[PDB]
Design a protein around this ligand. Structure first.
Ligand SMILES: Nc1nc2c(ncn2[C@@H]2O[C@H](COP(=O)(O)OP(=O)(O)OP(=O)(O)O)[C@@H](O)[C@H]2O)c(=O)[nH]1
Ligand SMILES: [Mg+2]
Lengths: 180, 18, 415, 177
């Protein structure tokens, strides 16, 4: 066998990668996906089904599959976990009541043997109001440091502003890509 | 030629009816 | 109000089905075959089937039965029209009507069926429009369907504007065994193969008896068709107002008008048949054919079918003009003639033996029919006056048309 | 067979997905119960190919009554397709929405029906009228709540004469029922 074609493809960029979109409803999942793909905050209705999109950055086409946080859509994340290489969690720092529910959902999702090779990707959504927590208080409340064998990074992003998306993407690429 | 009657040219209207 | 229309096969297997309303379970198609078998065996078979409270109307196609299950008392005529339109669309898209093409173009067939009708209401009926929107080898729907002019697609460009007309004449003669003709009707057919640039509006003009009487020229040979049906593109308002045949010709071959009126003239061919059949000993075929048409007209490919005995064998033919061949599949002798000039008189003398054992049951007396087709003959005498070809851009058209006379229901009752 | 088909459908190759869809359609047309693979085909639904969208919609319609619970993952796709610029795509989505015999499915499609009621395309108007008639037949109370009678009555007094005829037929069917 020969890998000359593979080397030629990888010389100019061949790796694409995968990504998933998880989080509670009204947590900036659709707005975050629109900002990542397009660059503007587009108003979206409730995520009854799912949103599928692909983002090309640094020569890697990371497909993003938005998943709603509805009660009827929360158990549907198991179907979207198949054929998924990455996972992004959208939290609501301004929703103290929903913080416990989001933490319980994240613990339930992370307790699946199939979802073991996916690194932790938590985005501090709603980072535009004073009620939003920091990158450490939210992680401490969610117990991100207690996820053994999980590579999770805390990033705070404002849905209106979009700041921190580039840093989160770079961190995800560094965690997933182990090349120069 | 063709069986079943050869094609013939047709006019545009009745010239005698004005 | 058919619940769903499906295409079946000769073995009872459904080639393809497409539900439109969902009010009838798809499993009812299985019971259709036993019901059809019972009806055929009991003589109660009809195209409109009935499985309890759900009616499964079926039409015998070339290779499969077009079963259209229905639930309520919907428009049976509308269902039949939809089935006929679907058959025409399939014939246009697929040159063969068999199971070979049913399982070969299913990907486009499903899309065509979905686009044809929805919720039991047909929506698309233009074969050209369907091909411009659904193809087997998608863009937005064409504006011609949305526009009023759905019988002439705009933007057509052609190097030459040539229209091929066809004056098809069908002579049907129902001659009883007593020698008197009961049903003598001639049905006209004005079919034109218009192939030009753009969407010209045809202005039909002919030597019609009604038109001549209205214009005061009701003194020459004017064709008074009992029934005249306009095409889809033909404007019925002009015809009702003053018999103005104004319509947009279609892109291709289409039937604009079809005359249909009774005939009071003598038959084109006078055929006298003699059955000198002995009692299980021999058979005599005293067939004499006289051409009552004009001598200037020749009947090309004349095939006068004379039904021979079902159990007859060892036949000998003594004719004068025209080859006679006995077809075992047809169980009859056809007086095949290549060219039959008008006024020709052909005499035939058949002679064959019969089996010694008598037949258990009778076979009936099918009528004798001929397959004569003499073109370039206008028996009705209707002459086309002009064809108003009007184009906004302005072009000189050179339409062509040929008058073809053939034998339709020219069946003579057997003795 | 089934496992290979599922693996092909769970791939990122468009040609492989098209081949798997064609094989499933042939099996479904040949008399194979492909309803068990409906949840697998649910993920491979949002596709740019028009031919693939039609096949997916046909499979969902044929697998909607069989798996009503699994049909809840198509409302988002239908809502997204309801704003498709292509009139053919909008007409196909409208036809598929009314063809789904789901009690809880037509409830979420009321907003798309209201949006498409005023479709400028005569084919779009006819598709909207057909979908409204299908919803009324499935749920007369739902149709009355949506208030499509006023829109249907004004439909006859509009252009798109074929769309006017379709609306008139739909109104007669509603009054006939
Ligand atoms: N305007 C604004 N909205 C934010 C911000 N952060 C989070 N959001 C929320 O993000 C939501 C965006 O809605 P969607 O586009 O539908 O995405 P989503 O948050 O996943 O909601 P669902 O799709 O229903 O699950 C809004 O409803 C807001 O409640 C922010 O900083 N500014
Ligand atoms: Mg969202």
């Amino acid at each position: 066998g020969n890998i000359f074609a593979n080397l030629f493809k990888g010389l100019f960029g061949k790796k694409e990668m995968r990504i998933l979109m998880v989080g509670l409803d009204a947590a900036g999942k659709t707005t975050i996906l629109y900002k990542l793909k397009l660059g503007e905050i587009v108003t979206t209705i409730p995520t009854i089904g799912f949103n599928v999109e692909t983002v090309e950055y640094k020569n890697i086409s990371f497909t993003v599959w938005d998943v709603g946080g509805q009660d009827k859509i929360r158990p549907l994340w198991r179907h979207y976990f198949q054929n998924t290489q990455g996972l992004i969690f959208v939290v609501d720092s301004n929703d103290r009541e929903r913080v416990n529910e989001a933490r319980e959902e994240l613990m339930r999702m992370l307790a699946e043997d199939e979802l073991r090779d996916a690194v932790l990707l938590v985005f501090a959504n709603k980072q535009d109001l004073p009620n939003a927590m920091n990158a450490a208080e939210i992680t401490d409340k969610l117990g991100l440091h207690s996820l053994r064998h999980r590579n999770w990074y805390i990033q705070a992003t404002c849905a209106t502003s979009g700041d921190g998306l580039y840093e989160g993407l770079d961190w995800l690429s560094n965690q997933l890509r182990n090349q120069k | 030629d063709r069986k079943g009657g050869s094609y013939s040219q047709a006019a545009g209207s009745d010239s005698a009816q004005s | 109000s058919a619940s769903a229309v499906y295409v079946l096969d000769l073995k009872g297997k459904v080639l393809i089905c497409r539900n439109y309303r969902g009010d009838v379970d798809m499993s009812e198609v299985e019971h259709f075959m036993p019901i059809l078998m019972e009806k055929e065996e009991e003589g109660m078979l009809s195209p409109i089937l009935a499985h309890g409270g759900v009616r499964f109307m079926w039409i015998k196609h070339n290779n499969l039965y077009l079963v259209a299950t229905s639930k309520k008392n919907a428009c049976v005529s509308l269902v039949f029209s939809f089935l006929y339109k679907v058959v025409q669309v399939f014939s246009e898209y697929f040159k063969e009507l068999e199971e070979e093409s049913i399982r070969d173009n299913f990907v486009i067939i499903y899309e065509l069926l979905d686009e044809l009708m929805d919720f039991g209401y047909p929506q698309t009926t233009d074969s050209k429009i369907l091909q411009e929107y659904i193809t087997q080898e998608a863009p937005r729907p064409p504006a011609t369907v949305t526009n009023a002019v759905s019988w002439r697609s705009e933007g057509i460009k052609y190097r030459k504007n040539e229209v091929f007309l066809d004056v098809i004449e069908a002579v049907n003669l129902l001659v009883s065994a007593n020698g008197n003709v009961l049903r003598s009707e001639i049905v006209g057919s004005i079919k034109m193969r218009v192939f030009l640039s753009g969407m010209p509006e045809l202005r039909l003009g002919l030597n019609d008896k009604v038109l001549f009487d209205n214009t005061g020229r009701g003194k020459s040979k004017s064709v008074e068709l009992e029934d005249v049906k306009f095409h889809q593109c033909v404007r019925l308002s002009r015809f009702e107002n003053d018999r103005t045949i104004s319509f947009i010709p279609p892109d291709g071959e289409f039937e604009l008008m079809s005359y249909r009126l009774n005939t009071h003239v003598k038959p084109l061919i006078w055929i006298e048949s003699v059955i000198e059949k002995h009692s299980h000993s021999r058979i005599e075929y005293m067939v004499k054919a006289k051409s009552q048409f004009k001598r200037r007209s020749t009947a090309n490919n004349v095939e006068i079918h004379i039904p021979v005995p079902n159990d007859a064998d060892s036949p000998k033919f003594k004719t004068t003009v025209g080859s006679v061949k006995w077809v075992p599949e047809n169980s009859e002798i056809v007086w095949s003639v290549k060219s039959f000039p008008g006024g020709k008189e052909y005499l035939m003398r058949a002679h064959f033996g019969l089996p010694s054992v008598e037949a258990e049951d009778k076979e009936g007396k099918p009528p004798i029919s001929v397959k004569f087709e003499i073109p370039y003959f206008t028996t009705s005498g209707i002459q086309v006056r002009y064809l108003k070809i009007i184009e906004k851009s302005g072009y000189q058209a050179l339409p062509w048309v040929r008058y073809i006379t053939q034998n339709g229901d020219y069946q003579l009752r057997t003795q | 067979e089934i496992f290979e088909l599922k693996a092909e459908l769970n791939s990122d190759k468009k040609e492989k997905k098209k081949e798997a869809v064609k094989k499933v359609i042939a099996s479904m047309t040949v008399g194979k119960d492909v309803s068990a693979l409906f949840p697998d085909v649910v993920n491979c639904m949002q596709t740019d190919n028009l031919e693939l969208k039609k096949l997916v919609y046909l499979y969902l319609m044929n697998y909607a009554k069989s798996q009503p619970d699994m049909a809840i993952m198509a409302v988002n796709t239908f809502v997204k397709d309801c704003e498709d610029p292509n009139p053919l795509i909008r007409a196909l989505a409208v036809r598929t929405m009314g063809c789904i015999r789901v009690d809880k499915i037509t409830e979420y499609l009321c907003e798309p029906l209201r949006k498409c009621l005023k479709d400028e395309d005569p084919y779009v108007r006819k598709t909207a009228a057909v979908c409204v008639a299908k919803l009324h037949d499935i749920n007369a109370q739902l149709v009355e709540d949506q208030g499509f009678l006023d829109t249907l009555k004004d439909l006859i007094s509009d252009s798109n004469p074929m769309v006017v005829a379709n609306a008139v037929a739909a109104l007669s069917e509603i009054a006939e029922s």
